[PDB]
Amino acid sequence: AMEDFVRQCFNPMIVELAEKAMKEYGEDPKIETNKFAAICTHLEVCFMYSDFGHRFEIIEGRDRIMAWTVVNSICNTTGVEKPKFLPDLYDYKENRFIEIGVTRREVHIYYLEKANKIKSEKTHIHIFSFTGEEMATKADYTLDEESRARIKTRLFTIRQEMASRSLWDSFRQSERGE
Numbered sequence: 001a002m003e004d005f006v007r008q009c010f011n012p013m014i015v016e017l018a019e020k021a022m023k024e025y026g027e028d029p030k031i032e033t034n035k036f037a038a039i040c041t042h043l044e045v046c047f048m049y050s051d052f053g054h055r056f057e058i059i060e061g062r063d064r065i066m067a068w069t070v071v072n073s074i075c076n077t078t079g080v081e082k083p084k085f086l087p088d089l090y091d092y093k094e095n096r097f098i099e100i101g102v103t104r105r106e107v108h109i110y111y112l113e114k115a116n117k118i119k120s121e122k123t124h125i126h127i128f129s130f131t132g133e134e135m136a137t138k139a140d141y142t143l144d145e146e147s148r149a150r151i152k153t154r155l156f157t158i159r160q161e162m163a164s165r166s167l168w169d170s171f172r173q174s175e176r177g178e
C-alpha cells in the first residue's frame with residue numbers, strides 16, 4: 001500500500017532517484033516503505049524550494065561526485081567555507097548553504113537534532129513539518145510567504161493522502177528518513 005502510494009503520489013524522476021539511492025545502500029524500497037516515502041517527500045521539498053528562484057543551486061538529488069563538484073565550485077568562487085556534510089541547496093542571494101529538514105516530530109526537536117549534527121557549520125537550517133510549522137535559523141525563512149505556503153500545503157497533502165489509506169500512523173511513528 002505504502003509502496004503503491006509512493007509510486008502514485010510522487011513524480012517518476014523523484015521515485016527513481018529515491019529508489020536508486022536506497023538500492024545502492026542495499027535498502028529495499030518494498031520493505032523500508034516508510035523510508036522510501038520519507039526520501040521522496042524530502043526530495044520533492046528540496047526541488048520545490050529550488051524552483052522558487054536561479055536563486056538556488058540544487059545539491060540534494062545528485063550523485064556524490066556531482067554534489068561535491070558543485071560544492072567545491074561554489075566554495076572556490078565565493079570563498080565560503082566547505083561543509084563536512086553535503087547540504088541540500090546553496091542560496092546565491094544570502095550566500096549560504098541550506099540544510100532542509102522534513103520531520104513528523106515537533107519542529108524544534110528536529111531543528112535541534114539537525115543543528116547538533118552540523119554545529120560548527122555556518123549552514124542555514126530550515127525545518128518543515130507535516131502540520132505547517134517550520135523553524136529556520138534566526139527565524140530567517142529565506143523564501144516568501146507563497147513559496148513557504150506551497151511547500152506546507154504539499155506536505156500536509158501527503159500527510160492526508162497517507163491518512164486516507166490508513167498509512168499515516170505507521171509513517172508518523174517512524175523516524176526512518178530523518
Ligand SMILES: Cc1cc(=O)c(O)c(C(=O)O)o1
Pocket residue numbers: 042060086087088100101102177178
Ligand atoms: C537523513 C537525511 C536527512 C536530510 O534532511 C538530508 O538532507 C539527508 C542527506 O542529504 O543525506 O539525509
Ligand SMILES: [Mn+2]
Pocket residue numbers: 060086087088
Ligand atoms: Mn541532503
Ligand SMILES: [Mn+2]
Pocket residue numbers: 042088099100101102
Ligand atoms: Mn535535508
